[PDB]
């Protein structure tokens, strides 16, 4: 279907692509600096769709090594 770069034609956004390139660059630093950049790698929040004004399901994020590389 889509038109664009190689991340855009695979169903991946720019923010998911450019965080992956920030994910993999953090891993290949020195451990004096990798443990510092480990702090900004962790993603912890929860989202919940709210369909009626009252309820919905919820989806917790607990990833410590960066953004989900998998297809979401």
């Amino acid at each position: 279907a889509p038109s664009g770069p190689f991340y855009r034609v695979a169903g991946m956004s720019y923010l998911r692509y450019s965080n992956i390139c920030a994910d993999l660059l953090r891993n290949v630093l020195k451990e004096p600096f990798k443990a510092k950049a480990q702090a900004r790698q962790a993603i912890h929040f929860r989202q919940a769709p709210y369909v009626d004004g009252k309820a919905g399901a919820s989806k917790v994020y607990e990833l410590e090594n960066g953004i989900p590389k998998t297809a979401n």
């Binding site: 923010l15 998911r16 962790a42 993603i43 929040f45």
Partner: peptide
């Protein structure tokens, strides 16, 4: 949509990116 428990450990750019992506859904 309701995002919560954002400020529990710390706020990162990768966390704000997934909140951004669902605004692009």
């Amino acid at each position: 949509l309701a995002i919560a428990d954002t400020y529990k450990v710390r706020v990162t750019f990768g966390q704000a990116s997934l909140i951004v992506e669902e605004l692009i859904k």
